[PDB]
Amino acid sequence: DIAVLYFMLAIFSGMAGTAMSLIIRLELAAPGSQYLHGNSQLFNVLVVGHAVLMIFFLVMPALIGGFGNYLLPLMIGATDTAFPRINNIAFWVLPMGLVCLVTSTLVESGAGTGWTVYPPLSSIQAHSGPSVDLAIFALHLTSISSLLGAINFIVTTLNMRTNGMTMHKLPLFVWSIFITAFLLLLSLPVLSAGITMLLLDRNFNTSFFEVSGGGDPILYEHLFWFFGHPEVYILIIPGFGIISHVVSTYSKKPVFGEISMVYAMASIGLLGFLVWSHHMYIVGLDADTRAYFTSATMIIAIPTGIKIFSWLATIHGGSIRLATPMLYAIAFLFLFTMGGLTGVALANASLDVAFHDTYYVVGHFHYVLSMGAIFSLFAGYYYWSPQILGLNYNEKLAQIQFWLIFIGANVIFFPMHFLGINGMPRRIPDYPDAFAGWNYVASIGSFIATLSLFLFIYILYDQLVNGLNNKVNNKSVIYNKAPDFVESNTIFNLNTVKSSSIEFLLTSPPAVHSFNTPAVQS
């Protein structure tokens, strides 16, 4: 259905975003080498094209909606997504925004001013290169399209619940992206209102986030925070669902703590809205207010810790089978524990006053968001891809892609925790002379990681040629070897095509109209 083009546009935009990574880091190698435009002419335009194109165009559609519109109805048992007309709306809205964003890059000067476009004089003074209106419209359509898919996923896992599943033992990806869309509702239209406010300010000269008229930019600063903090929780929580499923099926289908897991995910969904706070702790709010803020970011750090202790208990005591998605899950877990550690580090009160807009926070958020989200999307593709695409994915090249990604991204984003505390500024085009050390090996690592992306492209072209002696069966047979089936059902569905080893039983590729008969749980 929508999923195949939905994934093709994600890969297109991902190679565009890695090209932006290539250009930005190739400039950041040595002082003033590759590009003469060390200014917001072309360079801050490149970092905004990079950031907003890649977060909005890659992790957001593939992680929520691709696995959503292909794998939420197939895991809950639904025929199609409950409003089949507006997935089609939202996804065809998306590449019009890709055209809108590349038009924002192309025009005369370029008002690209970072992905978090702060008002005070991003105003009509910058609109001789009026790009930033096109950038905020591309973000506005991506905003409403993710909203539309969020409503669709909520209503699909509400009314089209197949008579198997009650609300007490639900799958983790299903309940995961239900919490994700239920969390997306409560944060999207606030920033839609902020888009139309500041667009009215920079078009029809009423200027309430700007300087004149006593306009105050801190209202917008609260607004885009209040959107962008649950935005990154949208960025990670279906990733937690996918990591739960791969940690399940490659080691041990008895996983640790389901009801505890879904309670912890609802705890993250509760406590994740009301701390927009740490992102500009520094600005000079009140002391009791910022102390309450610092205290509550610790309590948003608790339940994710409970979840990763649960998966730590899960991989323990199970027959691990080190395929490529199990390597993705174990690398996910190791790097995300350290990223949440540095989260607690930045989460303190009196340390953002030394850590804001430096490369220490940059290494931290690249660490959690890049490692977590892209390792989860890696696990999702190399996990569900022979089911949907019907072809086996040449396991040895998947192994070398994993190792090459791991060492490349690690040697990129580990030196930033050294470059940051010494006092690098953020989005610096030309850094001082005493910072030339670690950016060189960061550039080496960026070429390593884009080589691994090109290796992924050769694997994606190798998805044509039906290897049989490379990868056939996840969760190899226990003690049987003469009987042949998918070897695991911890609840006894086994109805027609749905079971407890959920949706591995459709066919390869699944039919254009599956689910004729309603499934049942034991």
Binding site: T103, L106, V107, E108
Partner: peptide, 29 residues
């Protein structure tokens, strides 16, 4: 019916042709 869908298809066709004619003025002044 479709007797109004035909001129609507026409005005939609010009409404998605002419902004693509607008964008070289947007890049070239």
């Amino acid at each position: 019916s479709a007797l109004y869908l035909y001129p609507f298809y026409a005005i939609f066709a010009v409404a998605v042709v002419t902004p693509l004619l607008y964008i070289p003025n947007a890049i070239r002044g």
